[PDB]
Amino acid sequence: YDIQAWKKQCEELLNLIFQCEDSEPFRQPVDLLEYPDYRDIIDTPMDFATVRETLEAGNYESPMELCKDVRLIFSNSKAYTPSKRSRIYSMSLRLSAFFEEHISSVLSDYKSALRFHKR
């Protein structure tokens, strides 16, 4: 029932994601010199360094907000991919599966702690 525990749990999950080779295309903002039309397709860029910095700045109130930004990294990859078989998009799918598998208990524990707090 610790309402604050999600933050360190998210820091540790971000550390695992940064060690994962599949996260390399998503660690920093997409380079517009490499992908000149990126902002014509993607309205809201997102990357894991921005998520980590937002968390460390104390600018997430809950793990649901962090989860919405991580999911935006994956939906941006899906929206920008020219093919469902592209290398970078395939890396995003594996990374998304790993993220979803690990964030599920973080979200459940937070929501349970908050319900206990408001009982």
Ligand SMILES: CCOC(=O)N1CCOCC1
């Ligand atoms: C295949 C889809 O492409 C992406 O997801 N990108 C990762 C971020 O930088 C641009 C390329």
